[PDB]
Design an enzyme around this catalytic site. Structure first.
Site, PDB file in Angstrom:
ATOM      1  CG  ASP A  37      47.690   3.211  -4.493  1.00  0.00           C
ATOM      2  OD1 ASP A  37      47.593   3.732  -5.526  1.00  0.00           O
ATOM      3  OD2 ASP A  37      48.035   3.794  -3.360  1.00  0.00           O
ATOM      4  CG  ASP A 233      46.904   6.382  -8.512  1.00  0.00           C
ATOM      5  OD1 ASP A 233      46.880   5.306  -7.755  1.00  0.00           O
ATOM      6  OD2 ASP A 233      47.044   7.505  -7.900  1.00  0.00           O
TER       7      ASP A 233
HETATM    8  C1  LIG Z   1      46.452   9.210  -4.889  1.00  0.00           C
HETATM    9  N1  LIG Z   1      46.794   8.321  -3.768  1.00  0.00           N
HETATM   10  C2  LIG Z   1      47.302   7.075  -3.858  1.00  0.00           C
HETATM   11  N2  LIG Z   1      47.357   6.654  -5.149  1.00  0.00           N
HETATM   12  N3  LIG Z   1      47.477   6.290  -3.008  1.00  0.00           N
HETATM   13  C3  LIG Z   1      47.567   6.884  -1.601  1.00  0.00           C
HETATM   14  C4  LIG Z   1      48.508   5.851  -0.818  1.00  0.00           C
HETATM   15  C5  LIG Z   1      46.073   6.506  -1.153  1.00  0.00           C
HETATM   16  C6  LIG Z   1      45.009   5.933  -1.975  1.00  0.00           C
HETATM   17  C7  LIG Z   1      43.820   5.862  -1.345  1.00  0.00           C
HETATM   18  N4  LIG Z   1      42.938   5.429  -2.255  1.00  0.00           N
HETATM   19  C8  LIG Z   1      41.371   5.300  -2.156  1.00  0.00           C
HETATM   20  O1  LIG Z   1      40.855   5.767  -1.307  1.00  0.00           O
HETATM   21  C9  LIG Z   1      40.548   4.928  -3.424  1.00  0.00           C
HETATM   22  C10 LIG Z   1      39.047   5.390  -3.485  1.00  0.00           C
HETATM   23  C11 LIG Z   1      38.709   5.086  -4.547  1.00  0.00           C
HETATM   24  C12 LIG Z   1      39.412   4.409  -5.794  1.00  0.00           C
HETATM   25  F1  LIG Z   1      38.826   4.081  -6.660  1.00  0.00           F
HETATM   26  C13 LIG Z   1      40.813   4.162  -5.485  1.00  0.00           C
HETATM   27  N5  LIG Z   1      41.414   4.599  -4.196  1.00  0.00           N
HETATM   28  C14 LIG Z   1      43.268   6.173  -0.184  1.00  0.00           C
HETATM   29  C15 LIG Z   1      44.330   6.564   0.726  1.00  0.00           C
HETATM   30  C16 LIG Z   1      45.767   6.757   0.389  1.00  0.00           C
HETATM   31  F2  LIG Z   1      46.711   7.219   1.098  1.00  0.00           F
HETATM   32  C17 LIG Z   1      48.101   8.107  -1.297  1.00  0.00           C
HETATM   33  S1  LIG Z   1      47.319   9.302  -2.323  1.00  0.00           S
HETATM   34  O2  LIG Z   1      48.053  10.340  -2.554  1.00  0.00           O
HETATM   35  O3  LIG Z   1      45.892   9.541  -1.886  1.00  0.00           O
END
Ligand SMILES: CN1C(N)=N[C@](C)(c2cc(NC(=O)c3ccc(F)cn3)ccc2F)CS1(=O)=O
EC number: 3.4.23.46
Length: 388
Positions: A37, A233
């Site tokens: 991430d 991101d």
């Molecule tokens: C946008 N976000 C991010 N970049 N990181 C966080 C840590 C996050 C990411 C995910 N990411 C995912 O679930 C996800 C899903 C499909 C993808 F291609 C990429 N990431 C899940 C929980 C979470 F807290 C916070 S968020 O504000 O939601």
């Protein structure tokens, strides 16, 4: 030549659920799959049973676990997690051959955080300390890795979309891409790498200076493209655009694809669209070019994506179905996984810049390919950045 064979093909996953890398935590090592991430800065792992977790970090079984005696509560729009801070020894089996002592947020409670069937149990936040929780004194993993070893301060990502749906067994058996820690592997891209400055070290913030749909300028004040920031991101699925930019872009994409009418639910990213097997009319959908600030004064370059990137393959039948993977944001532009699937992206933290090249695994057709091209003369690019 590809000089990082040990790290090539170390990712698995897909744009719907995330791309992850295997890591180990503790002594003896406990293996976990971890979401890559670039949009957060905490190393946060499931550390208590959850219906969507098949495994989790067991601190009581690690002889090298150190308790920091501090809790952390992290609420997002997308869900929330509560955890306990500590440190432990961490390794990446298909990474550099090093072990480092890193901060770990042991997740004890969560709401809509873990994804059923994602195959990951934690998140590796690769962005900067400024956005670490609870505050910037909690050193992120990559900062620990660079400080404790001779690993160069750079990493690069090649996220590989299959171009079609992968079932539960196929997504586990399939290679989803590469995370090259400490370098650039020249086998993962074609053409040249073009670099955009990291505007500020918090998120991986960049500046977009022009947007085209099939070569037609969206013609908005460039500040709108970066209102209130633009970031890269890997922890977001879609290309997310500020409300006004989203409205203008969807109007233009609808006009370019006007030979077929799609329901409102499709453009809202909620409803799938299907075509008979092999007949997806890629050619009716436009390419999208995002021009980024270059490293040279008054110079920019562009990255061009195809509908094969912004239409996400989903299962319905033998029809080929997709969801529209461009959506509205109230927190700025987000170049998510579907955009990253078109490119090899170099996070050159040492030189405060992000590089883009066409990915050797991007999905295309016989008539069009993704592109990274330049230079273009662009004036007053600093004015495109949003302040306050
Ligand atoms: C946008 N976000 C991010 N970049 N990181 C966080 C840590 C996050 C990411 C995910 N990411 C995912 O679930 C996800 C899903 C499909 C993808 F291609 C990429 N990431 C899940 C929980 C979470 F807290 C916070 S968020 O504000 O939601």
């Amino acid at each position: 030549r590809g000089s990082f064979v040990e790290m090539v093909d170390n990712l698995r996953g897909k744009s719907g659920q995330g791309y992850y890398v295997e890591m180990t935590v503790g002594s003896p090592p406990q293996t976990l799959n971890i979401l890559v991430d670039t949009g957060s800065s905490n190393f946060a792992v499931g550390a208590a049973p959850h219906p969507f977790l098949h495994r989790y970090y067991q601190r009581q079984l690690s002889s090298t676990y150190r308790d920091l005696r501090k809790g952390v509560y992290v609420p997002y729009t997308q869900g929330k997690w509560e955890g306990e801070l500590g440190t432990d020894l961490v390794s990446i089996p298909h990474g550099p051959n090093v072990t480092v002592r890193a901060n770990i947020a042991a997740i004890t409670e969560s709401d809509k955080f873990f994804i059923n069937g994602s195959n990951w149990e934690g998140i590796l936040g690769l962005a900067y300390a400024e956005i670490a929780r609870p505050d910037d004194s909690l050193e992120p993993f990559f900062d620990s890795l660079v400080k404790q070893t001779h690993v160069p301060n750079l990493f690069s990502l090649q996220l590989c979309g299959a171009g079609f749906p992968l079932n539960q067994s196929e997504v586990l058996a399939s290679v989803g891409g590469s995370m090259i820690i400490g370098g650039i592997d020249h086998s993962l891209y074609t053409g040249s790498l073009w670099y955009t400055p990291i505007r500020r070290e918090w998120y991986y913030e960049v500046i977009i200076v022009r947007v085209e749909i099939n070569g037609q300028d969206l013609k908005m004040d460039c500040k709108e493209y970066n209102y209130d920031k633009s970031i890269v991101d890997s922890g977001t699925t879609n290309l997310r655009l500020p409300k006004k930019v989203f409205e203008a872009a969807v109007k233009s994409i609808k006009a370019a694809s006007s030979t077929e009418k799609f329901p409102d639910g499709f453009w809202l990213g909620e409803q799938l669209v299907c075509w008979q097997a092999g007949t997806t009319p890629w050619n009716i959908f436009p390419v999208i070019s995002l021009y980024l600030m270059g490293e040279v004064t008054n110079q920019s370059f562009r990255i061009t994506i195809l509908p094969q990137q912004y239409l996400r393959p989903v299962e319905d039948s033998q029809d080929d179905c997709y969801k529209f993977a461009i959506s509205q944001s109230s927190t700025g532009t987000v170049m998510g996984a579907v955009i990253m699937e078109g490119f090899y992206v170099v996070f050159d933290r040492a030189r405060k810049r992000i590089g883009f090249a066409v990915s050797a695994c991007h999905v295309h057709d016989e008539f069009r390919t993704a592109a990274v091209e330049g230079p273009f003369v662009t004036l007053d690019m600093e004015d495109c950045g949003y302040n306050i």
